[PDB]
Amino acid sequence: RKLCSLDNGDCDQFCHEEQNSVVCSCARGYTLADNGKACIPTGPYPCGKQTLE
Amino acid sequence: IVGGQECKDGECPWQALLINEENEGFCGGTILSEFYILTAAHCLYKRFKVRVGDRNTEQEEGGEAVHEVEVVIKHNRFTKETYDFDIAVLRLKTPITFRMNVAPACLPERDWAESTLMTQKTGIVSGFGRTHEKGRQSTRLKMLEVPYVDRNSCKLSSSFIITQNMFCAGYDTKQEDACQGDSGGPHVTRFKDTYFVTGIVSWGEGCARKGKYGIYTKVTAFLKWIDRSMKT
Numbered sequence: 001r002k003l004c005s006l007d008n009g010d011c012d013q014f015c016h017e018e019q020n021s022v023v024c025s026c027a028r029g030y031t032l033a034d035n036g037k038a039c040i041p042t043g044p045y046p047c048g049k050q051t052l053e
Numbered sequence: 054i055v056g057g058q059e060c061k062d063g064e065c066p067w068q069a070l071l072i073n074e075e076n077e078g079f080c081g082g083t084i085l086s087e088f089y090i091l092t093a094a095h096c097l098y099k100r101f102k103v104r105v106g107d108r109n110t111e112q113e114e115g116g117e118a119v120h121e122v123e124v125v126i127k128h129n130r131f132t133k134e135t136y137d138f139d140i141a142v143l144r145l146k147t148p149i150t151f152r153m154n155v156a157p158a159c160l161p162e163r164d165w166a167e168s169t170l171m172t173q174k175t176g177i178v179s180g181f182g183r184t185h186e187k188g189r190q191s192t193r194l195k196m197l198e199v200p201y202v203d204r205n206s207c208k209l210s211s212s213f214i215i216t217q218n219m220f221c222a223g224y225d226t227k228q229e230d231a232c233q234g235d236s237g238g239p240h241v242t243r244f245k246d247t248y249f250v251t252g253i254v255s256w257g258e259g260c261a262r263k264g265k266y267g268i269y270t271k272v273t274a275f276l277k278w279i280d281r282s283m284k285t
């Protein structure tokens with residue numbers, strides 16, 4: 001297990017391997033955080049989240 | 054849905070219900086965005102609307118909304134005898150206002166979904182369909198965890214062809230499965246508390262029969278097609 005095969009490469013969502021390196025990305029409506037791994041909602045009711053209010 | 058449990062408040066917000074002229078549900082769908090619904094091509098056989106935000110069809114909650122359909126976009130390669138290319142996208146006349154019990158499911162990227170989502174132990178299917186093969190449809194929205202099934206095993210168990218556009222999920226003997234009226238509805242896969250669309254409820258030889266599984270349209274084979282449909 002290497003890169004994306006090892007715990008999703010530490011990415012919150014999409015993991016891609018480029019030139020022996022992990023590159024993370026996010027679904028539409030999320031922006032990649034400063035650490036280049038976490039996915040942050042841009043607005044209210046982001047996709048894929050159960051609703052709490 | 055045979056077996057499983059009720060979707061609790063806010064748990065299945067991407068569920069849509071296609072309703073006929075008598076306000077009765079005949080098929081499901083998945084909310085993809087404020088303007089688009091994903092469903093099964095076979096469900097499109099004349100005049101119907103789309104209901105969202107419903108969990109109990111016998112009570113007025115206050116979250117429910119009916120939407121008219123502006124355009125029906127059916128896959129042109131859909132075949133009635135095999136149910137191959139069983140996929141359609143609907144554009145609504147007015148946008149859906151997201152709220153409690155009304156939100157979209159995420160579309161994943163193909164490669165990641167196939168290596169990481171479809172290799173998970175289970176997916177989740179949901180609907181207002183029959184609660185057993187020869188019963189009535191449910192007045193309550195239900196959900197069920199369904200294991201991904203090995204592709205070779207599925208082909209061996211099936212009396213009808215399993216194309217490259219289909220995959221199998223469910224149980225060998227346990228009494229849990231999707232059923233009549235669930236067709237066109239969501240099969241989603243959870244990953245780090247985010248739910249991605251992985252399938253469309255398509256067909257099966259009865260409901261929860263021994264040595265038989267649920268057959269779903271393979272969404273990952275249609276991601277470019279879905280993207281094109283949602284632009285024009």
Ligand SMILES: C[C@@H](C(=O)N1CCCN(C)CC1)N1CC[C@H](N(CC(N)=O)S(=O)(=O)c2ccc3cc(Cl)ccc3c2)C1=O
Nearest residue numbers: 134135136213231232233254255256257258259260267268
């Ligand atoms: C084989 C397939 C059928 O008639 N086909 C499929 C391919 C075979 N060709 C020859 C005809 C069409 N069939 C047989 C009957 C069955 N139902 C449809 C119906 N109108 O009675 S069902 O309601 O029992 C049903 C529907 C959807 C399901 C989805 C899942 Cl994931 C699991 C169980 C389901 C049960 C149904 O779908």
Ligand SMILES: [Ca+2]
Nearest residue numbers: 109110112114
């Ligand atoms: Ca209701």
